[PDB]
Amino acid sequence: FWTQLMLLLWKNFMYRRRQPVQLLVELLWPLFLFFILVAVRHSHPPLEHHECHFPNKPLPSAGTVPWLQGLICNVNNTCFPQLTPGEEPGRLSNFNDSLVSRLLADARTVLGGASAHRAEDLAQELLALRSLVELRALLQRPRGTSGPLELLSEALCSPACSELIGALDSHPLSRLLWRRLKPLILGKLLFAPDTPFTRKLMAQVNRTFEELTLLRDVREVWEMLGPRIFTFMDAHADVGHLVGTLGRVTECLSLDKLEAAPSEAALVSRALQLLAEHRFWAGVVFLGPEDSSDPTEHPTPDLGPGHVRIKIRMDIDVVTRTNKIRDRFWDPGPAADPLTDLRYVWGGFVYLQDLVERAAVRVLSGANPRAGLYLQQMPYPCYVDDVFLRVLSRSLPLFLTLAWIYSVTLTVKAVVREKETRLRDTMRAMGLSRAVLWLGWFLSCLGPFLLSAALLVLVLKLGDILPYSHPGVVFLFLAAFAVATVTQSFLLSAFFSRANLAAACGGLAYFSLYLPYVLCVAWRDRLPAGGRVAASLLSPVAFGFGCESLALLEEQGEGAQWHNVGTRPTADVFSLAQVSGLLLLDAALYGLATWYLEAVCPGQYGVLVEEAPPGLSPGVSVRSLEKRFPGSPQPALRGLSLDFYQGHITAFLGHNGAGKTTTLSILSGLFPPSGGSAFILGHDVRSSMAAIRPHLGVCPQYNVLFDMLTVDEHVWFYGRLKGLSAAVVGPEQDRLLQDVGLVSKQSVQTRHLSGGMQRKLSVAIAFVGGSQVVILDEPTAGVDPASRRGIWELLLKYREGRTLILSTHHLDEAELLGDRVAVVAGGRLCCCGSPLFLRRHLGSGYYLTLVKAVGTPQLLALVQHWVPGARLVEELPHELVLVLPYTGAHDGSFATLFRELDTRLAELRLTGYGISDTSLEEIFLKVVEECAADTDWALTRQQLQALLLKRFLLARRSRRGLFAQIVLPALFVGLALVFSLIVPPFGHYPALRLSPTMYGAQVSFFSEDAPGDPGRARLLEALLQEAGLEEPPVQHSSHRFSAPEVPAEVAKVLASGNWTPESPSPACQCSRPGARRLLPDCPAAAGGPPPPQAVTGSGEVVQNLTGRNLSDFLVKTYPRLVRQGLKTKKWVNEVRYGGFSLGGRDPGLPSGQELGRSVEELWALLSPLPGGALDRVLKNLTAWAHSLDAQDSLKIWFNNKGWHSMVAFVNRASNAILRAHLPPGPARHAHSITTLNHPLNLTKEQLSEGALMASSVDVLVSICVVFAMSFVPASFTLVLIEERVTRAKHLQLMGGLSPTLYWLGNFLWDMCNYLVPACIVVLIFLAFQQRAYVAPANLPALLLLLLLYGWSITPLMYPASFFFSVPSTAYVVLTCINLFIGINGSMATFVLELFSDQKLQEVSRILKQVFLIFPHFCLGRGLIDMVRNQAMADAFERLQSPLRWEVVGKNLLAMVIQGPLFLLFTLLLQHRSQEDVARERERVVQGATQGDVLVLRNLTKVYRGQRMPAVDRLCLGIPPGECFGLLGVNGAGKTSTFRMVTGDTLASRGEAVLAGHSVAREPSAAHLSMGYCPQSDAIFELLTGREHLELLARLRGVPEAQVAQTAGSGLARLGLSWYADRPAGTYSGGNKRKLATALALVGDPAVVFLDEPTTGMDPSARRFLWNSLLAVVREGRSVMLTSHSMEECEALCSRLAIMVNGRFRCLGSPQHLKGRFAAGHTLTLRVPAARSQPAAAFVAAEFPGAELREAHGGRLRFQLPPGGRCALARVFGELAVHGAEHGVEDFSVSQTMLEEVFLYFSKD
């Protein structure tokens, strides 16, 4: 059991070692992919980012100075690691060291002090002020700045406008700020409705800009107070310079920047016009509830007024996209980038929403609410950003499968190859169980897999791809994967019966099972938990599911290790060990599947007796052996009771189908006997089992050798397997090697270098165990007769002792070697015995014939006198045949009769006698039928016409296939167009209702500071009851404690620490220690320790958090909220989006009443102006001082990952304020405000880019058209490939056909066939009303493009007919290649077009400039280009043409240029090719006979590497009036000479001339008069035979009116009347041969060539061929016939030439040969002594001529000079003594037998 496994493993290792280039490629292919992966890793290392905090943004409602301060200082949005002062519940401002704030505080305190006082005291107070000094220093600055923006930033933290432009264009930061401010400074507010209510709303919009325009009055009062004081009496210059600077800034002010529009269409037109001038900024639409014109939204929520809907339309390049709520790829980032994401800050959307909402509340409420709104960004933890790990999670299975596709292909190829040559059956014959075979396969294939896995593990660990992990677990994963994939490859090898088919399908079967993993990862959340395990039954799917868990565990900073093998890293991911368990279960299931499937198709591979020897020792005793198959009710083998005997070489006789090899397999260990017994050596076959193998040898009818192992390893392997010991193999090896004469070959150790002799070696293998019984099976099945002598010598060498049982098809072989013969025919035995006994039992006797150049009764009386027995069988004139009695036949009587007849020859006028001994052939036949009975220019026009007709009939023969290949794609396209009538989603921007409720269930805040006020209490009530909470606040007091219970294990930790809310209460948080990377921060159990009070309303949770830290709580709690949905990381639903803090502390000085009183007192005094301008200024100042209190504020925290959170929460705040200031009652339900977002249409320049991303249905239609359009050329080319496989094409070429004209005819017919599908597609497009195609300016372009693409595509794959030789696979491969090329081109172009965000891809347009050289992509590009150009034209002017040579003209021109070059290439590819014997050779050399039709001279062929000429130095001459014949054994070179003379092949040396026209010098006239007939059937099965006949008739040039009549003649000479109507496909075996003969004969060629015209068909067919050839030979025409059957050559031909080894031998007429050497007699002696000298000596002494023939041990034949003067009897009497003189049992004489010419044919 172990020795067989060792031998199998050694053999497999030897196969692998003898291929020293496949191992290297298998090792170095998977390393390339992983080196690419390592390079990719080196390209993108992970990025690290620490914690950072964000400042606050003040809305204009809070103030104007802080507003500009924010717009000028917080533009960069830089992170700050330290906590910002704004976040703390106390402060509400960030800038405390700013000059503006200090100046305002100093002014306030000085004014308060002055008011309290009411000069020296005031001067002293103002002297100690650094802010005034800083302001004076800033005023006294000699430029030093790029522009006023820099000075404004330093202070805070028209031709004049042209000068400002010139100054500000220099500084890049000033450029950025100026770009941000340009839309808004020069803005043009527009509104559609002009009703008075809207007028009041825009009056509320006015009042802000009116407050803005107040510096003019203060300025003018300054210059009207200036000169007065100056006349009454550095500071004066500084104020004037400052005032003039202020005036210059206000010079480039829009002032009246508000405008109006009459209607929505006019609104859009005016907006686009202003965009053309770069002046448009925003537009507002006050849609009314009663209008009911709501696109994709409800008309009105409640009847009547009270609800205001407001739409803001701005430029798309400014307002963010408004289609999807969230990003599709979650990123570990704060999502705070001013340039890209923070668009609402420099876009002004929030500003205008605030302004409009405040106007609406001030109008509807009827009060003047004051509440400053601020915006804050929640802070974000420290993080590591690394996209690569998700890429591994999604990519690693792909690279692993691509690395292991190669070894799987090799494994399946090897398994199928070894199971193809039936070697497995031979191994099972010797006794090896299938289990050992499969175990050898397992352990031999599984080595390289694990070596590759180990190398991959080392690469992964060392290459930093999977660090922080222990390689042991990774290896235990890859090993399970390798086991599963090897088992599944063995399963894949169990469905195929061909080598290359299995090799090319196994890789595809392995790769096609990785797609479901992608399908599952796309809809990751869709699939439940139940279907996960069911889908993970595939091996690659399970590997992917395990790889995702491995990557997920890698993200958490601790890789795969022994600690966490059985731990699930997330609630819905497999543990790493469970995946391996499933992998092993899958491998076991695949193994069981292979085991069961191997048994699905079992079995099928895909009374005369002479028993009396001197020693009766029945070594093999088979009795009544029977077997039956279910294929036929009659048994495969019937009763066979024959008994064999040791020492005799029994043999089997029968024609193929006699069930001999079946029985020989029964006796071996391959098949089971159904009945009877098969006792070998005494013990039954099954009982012996393994007790019989050393004493039983088998050799099968197929050669059994390994193409890589040498001879010595071969004998070693086949000896050690039988039971031989390793010590005694040397002598046995040497014995067999010396016996077979391979002692030289074992020196070079080759197996595939030597051929033909290999069968000999196989025979020797049957004699390696010295087994007593040996069963051979046709040891000379196919070996050349020239080498059967060695096999005969070896088999006779081992003829003693061993029982040998063989079987041969022949009849001569069964008597040379065999000591006995039994005849089996029709699966049954008929007779048995020995050749002597078989020849001694006949109805007839021993024949004697006499010819005439006297009297029958006289000769009969003479014969009866000389011998009593005599039978008269034949009595016709000119030959008298009598039967001499075999019963009691004696030599003396025959000798006396012959001696008497010798003298009386002249008188009797006989002049010749012929004796005859019955032979084995006729007795074999007679017993076979006895057993059978007992069982029961105009010519070119006609040529093209005929070719087109034959193509049309060829198409009409196969109509269903062409119909399904042509019409079906059109119906497919039509159905695709029908089903594509749904609304196309392309990315339009609908109307979106911007409210917080769109996000869904969430958690929100209501933090409050300084709650000591009733108005703030009302505002808080509005905020809470706005979200759906219960109306009475006291109910919350009824709920009392509404918080989750604190964790018990955390209470002790809290008691350990201070736990004050102001101090950091939570414990610290883990982060990146440098040696380890964590994606989130791992949260402890104490983050924001006390669970804050939460109340749930209607799908929403509100939390208190009053008085806590807030920032710390959010930073600590965020990852806990996120992690619930990081398993898939596709659409992450953050739960906390925003919240409110009711801050109340006033950063400014609240004491503004005193300042107002002081201003009023100053207004009363100082001579107020009668006009009141100063009075109005002072009133405005008093109002500003009164409003300076800022009684209540509000801050909104928002999360930026939700795109539309800022606007939703600002809307909520405004609505809450409105509901707060409205008096209580049911009227609260009547009032509401709504805000929408709707970007405007694209401008023309914007359209020129935006039209690109509106093509999905177009892409689908183009893909469908390309897929359905690339089928026809393959259908065209399959027919040509099929006609190339058969040599019928060349048969056409000997007609009038030329290859160029054949190509032209095929091209024209395929054009005519192709013109229909294009018309069908065109009519489908026209009938289905596609505006994209039914336009009159688009139809001609589409038609021309389709027709010219079909023009160009066809000659692409015509040159491919030479490469392939089978129709179906050629069609499949060509279709797949074309579809792959088209789809890849289209996808690459569309991907580069959509993803062309960066500029270095637009130059990739040159790539398409190359694709015009590819003809398949021209149509796909042209359709898309035409569609986009025409759609742009439709959308351009309504709200240049396809025929122009700018969109499709260039592509069409390039493709029509490409058209003819492929036809030229295939036309050039077609024409790529550019003693009697001595006396007749001498007469040919000296001169040429003019009458001879064919003349040859030194005809020679030298193949490549054969080292010997197949046909060498061949000469001949054929007179026209005689039929020729060529003879030779297989391998002589007759077919090579036939091909060379016909012209299908070239000649290495020498040329043959036919009727004075050499083949090379001008082939056309040569082929005009040659009738080609090969052994193969060169016909088209689709057509009919008669149709072939008229096709050849029309090609030749027969007039049409007689062509049909010719058909009758074309059958009248060869019958064919019953088979005329039937198609050529459904005929008989000989019908094809006779049809080929008729096609050769039709047309009346001068000479007719036939290669093996008849090979064992019905006698009627050969009689008809005989008649046809006789006709053509006595009508004065010549035939060159090649055959084997000698009687046909005798009957038909008049000259015979015999050739062996490529050279003539006799070259004479049949009668000349018969008289030259086939006369006399030959003697055969049966000597058992096997001694040459005793038999040779006396024969040479008495007879001068004793030439040897087949000198073997059993028999020897004698050649002697003919024409003995004495009688023939002169030998017989001598033999009558010679039996005593020398050992001779019996004898035979062949004296002018019917087999003399046969004997010479077999002689040489």
Ligand X SMILES: Nc1ncnc2c1ncn2[C@@H]1O[C@H](COP(=O)(O)OP(=O)(O)OP(O)(O)=S)[C@@H](O)[C@H]1O
Ligand Y SMILES: *[C@@H]1O[C@H](CO)[C@@H](O[C@@H]2O[C@H](CO)[C@@H](O)[C@H](O)[C@H]2NC(C)=O)[C@H](O)[C@H]1NC(C)=O
Chain residues that interact with ligand NAG, rule: CB under 6 A: 75-76, 78, 83, 88, 91, 96, 173, 176, 199, 202-203, 206, 256, 258, 1061-1062, 1064, 1109, 1111-1112
Element (H, E) at 1771: helix 1769-1781
Query: Which residues, other chains included, contact 53 with Cβ-Cβ below 8 Å and sequence gap of 6+?
Result: 79, 80, 81, 82, 83, 84, 87, 379, 1111
Task: Rank residues 359 and 1639 by Cβ distance to ligand NAG and give the closer one.
Answer: 359
Q: Which does 566 bind (CB under 5 to 8 A by kind): ligand NAG, ligand X, ligand Y, none?
A: none
Q: Which does 1508 bind (CB under 5 to 8 A by kind): ligand NAG, ligand Y, ligand X, none?
A: none
Task: Rank residues 1707 and 1789 by Cβ distance to ligand X and give the closer one.
Answer: 1707
Give the whole-angstrom CA distance, residue 180 versus residue 209.
20
Show the 3-state SS of 1449-1501.
HHHHHHHHHHHHHHHHHHHHHHCCCCCHHHHHHHHHHHCCCCCCCEEEEEEEE
Show the 3-state SS of 13-58.
HHHHHCCCCHHHHHHHHHHHHHHHHHHHHHHCCCEEECCEECCEEE
Note whether 660 binds ligand X by CB under 6 A.
Answer: yes
Minimum Å gap between C-beta 538 and ligand NAG is 51
Query: Which residues, other chains included, contact 149 with Cβ-Cβ below 8 Å and sequence gap of 6+?
Result: 72, 168, 171, 174, 177, 178
Report helix angle 22-43 to 434-462, nearest 10: 30
For 910, the token pair is 């006989």
Identify the three-state secondary structure at position 1001.
Answer: coil
Task: Rank residues 498 and 1039 by Cβ distance to ligand X and give the closer one.
Answer: 498
Task: Rank residues 271 and 1288 by Cβ distance to ligand NAG and give the closer one.
Answer: 271
Stretch that binds ligand Y, among 641-649, 1031-1039, 1131-1139, 1163-1171 (CB under 6 A): 1031-1039
Minimum Å gap between C-beta 625 and ligand X is 14
Is 50 annotated to bind ligand? no
The DSSP code for 1296 is: T
Stretch that binds ligand Y, among 91-99, 207-215, 485-493, 1033-1041 (CB under 6 A): 1033-1041
Note whether 1241 binds ligand Y by CB under 6 A.
Answer: yes
Give the whole-angstrom CA distance, residue 201 versus residue 361.
10
Minimum Å gap between C-beta 1043 and ligand Y is 10
- Binding marks (x or -) toward ligand Y, 1103..1122, rule CB under 6 A? -x-x----------------
Task: Rank residues 1528 and 1571 by Cβ distance to ligand X and give the closer one.
Answer: 1528
Stretch that binds ligand X, among 206-214, 650-658, 969-977, 1344-1352 (CB under 6 A): 650-658
Q: Which does 1036 bind (CB under 5 to 8 A by kind): ligand NAG, ligand X, ligand Y, none?
A: ligand Y
DSSP code string of 381-411: --EEE-SHHHHHHHHHHHHHHHHHHHHHHHH
**According to CB under 6 A, which one of 268, 492, 824, 1496 is a site residue for ligand Y?**
268
Task: Rank residues 378 and 1593 by Cβ distance to ligand NAG and give the closer one.
Answer: 378
Minimum Å gap between C-beta 1197 and ligand Y is 17
Give the whole-angstrom CA distance, residue 1510 versus residue 900.
54
- Binding marks (x or -) toward ligand X, 1625..1654, rule CB under 6 A? --------------------------xx--
How many residues lie near ligand Y (CB under 6 A)? 10
Note whether 1033 binds ligand Y by CB under 6 A.
Answer: yes
CA distances from 1282 to 1095, 1277, 1371, 1577 (A): 81, 9, 11, 13
Task: Rank residues 422 and 852 by Cβ distance to ligand X and give the closer one.
Answer: 422
Give the whole-angstrom CA distance, residue 1261 versus residue 1264.
5
Query: Which residues, other chains included, contact 1712 with Cβ-Cβ below 8 Å and sequence gap of 6+?
Result: 1476
Note whether 1187 binds ligand X by CB under 6 A.
Answer: no
Stretch that binds ligand X, among 166-174, 843-851, 1255-1263, 1532-1540 (CB under 6 A): 1532-1540
Q: Which does 1531 bind (CB under 5 to 8 A by kind): ligand X, ligand NAG, ligand Y, none?
A: ligand X
Give the whole-angstrom CA distance, residue 1422 versus residue 1455.
11
Note whether 1439 binds ligand Y by CB under 6 A.
Answer: yes
Q: Which does 1033 bind (CB under 5 to 8 A by kind): ligand X, ligand NAG, ligand Y, none?
A: ligand Y
Is 660 annotated to bind ligand? yes
User: Would strands 372-377 and 56-58 be described as parallel, antiparallel, or unpaired?
Assistant: antiparallel
Q: Which does 1106 bind (CB under 5 to 8 A by kind): ligand NAG, ligand X, ligand Y, none?
A: ligand Y
CA angle at 725 for the pair 722 and 731, rounded to the nearest 5°: 100
Q: Which does 96 bind (CB under 5 to 8 A by kind): ligand Y, ligand X, ligand NAG, none?
A: ligand NAG
Q: Which does 1534 bind (CB under 5 to 8 A by kind): ligand NAG, ligand X, ligand Y, none?
A: ligand X
DSSP code string of 262-298: SSHHHHHHHHHHHHHTT----EEEEE-TTT---TTS-
Please say whether the beta carbons of 124 and 148 come within 8 A: no
Minimum Å gap between C-beta 604 and ligand X is 4
Task: Rank residues 1133 and 1536 by Cβ distance to ligand X and give the closer one.
Answer: 1536
User: Would strands 1007-1008 and 1138-1142 be described as parallel, antiparallel, or unpaired?
Assistant: parallel
Give the whole-angstrom CA distance, residue 375 versus residue 696.
99
Phi, psi of 228 (to 5 degrees): -60, -50
Minimum Å gap between C-beta 1447 and ligand Y is 23
Note whether 1506 binds ligand X by CB under 6 A.
Answer: yes
Minimum Å gap between C-beta 367 and ligand Y is 24
Minimum Å gap between C-beta 1650 and ligand X is 11
Minimum Å gap between C-beta 199 and ligand NAG is 5
Note whether 632 binds ligand X by CB under 6 A.
Answer: yes
Minimum Å gap between C-beta 203 and ligand NAG is 5
For 398, the token pair is 């792909």
The neighbouring-strand residues paired with 1008 are 1142
1149: left (phi > 0), else alpha (psi -120 to 50), else beta?
beta
Please say whether the beta carbons of 1163 and 1178 come within 8 A: yes
Question: Tokens 């009105």 — which residue?
Answer: 300
Is 661 annotated to bind ligand? yes
Give the whole-angstrom CA distance, residue 1749 versus residue 1759.
7
Minimum Å gap between C-beta 95 and ligand NAG is 9
**According to CB under 6 A, which one of 1195, 1534, 1662, 1677 is a site residue for ligand X?**
1534
Give the whole-angstrom CA distance, residue 315 versus residue 268.
11
Show the 3-state SS of 434-452.
HHHHHHHHHHHHHHHHHHH
Is 1459 annotated to bind ligand? no
The neighbouring-strand residues paired with 806 are 651
Is 658 annotated to bind ligand? yes
Q: Which does 631 bind (CB under 5 to 8 A by kind): ligand NAG, ligand Y, ligand X, none?
A: ligand X
Q: In a 10 Å sphere around its CB, with 0-12 CB exposed, 13-18 middle and 19+ buried, how is residue 1439 labelled?
A: exposed
Minimum Å gap between C-beta 1689 and ligand X is 15
Chain centre distance of CA 288: 59
The neighbouring-strand residues paired with 1698 are 1527
Q: Which does 1241 bind (CB under 5 to 8 A by kind): ligand X, ligand Y, ligand NAG, none?
A: ligand Y
Is 1268 annotated to bind ligand? no
Task: Rank residues 423 and 1242 by Cβ distance to ligand Y and give the closer one.
Answer: 1242
Task: Rank residues 103 and 1373 by Cβ distance to ligand NAG and give the closer one.
Answer: 103
| Chain positions contacting ligand X, by CB under 6 A | 604, 629, 631-632, 636, 656-662, 1506, 1510, 1530-1536, 1575, 1651-1652
Binding residues: 654-661, 1528-1535
Interacting residue ranges for ligand Y, rule: CB under 6 A: 268, 295, 1033, 1036-1037, 1093, 1104, 1106, 1241, 1439
Binding residues for ATP: 654-661, 1528-1535
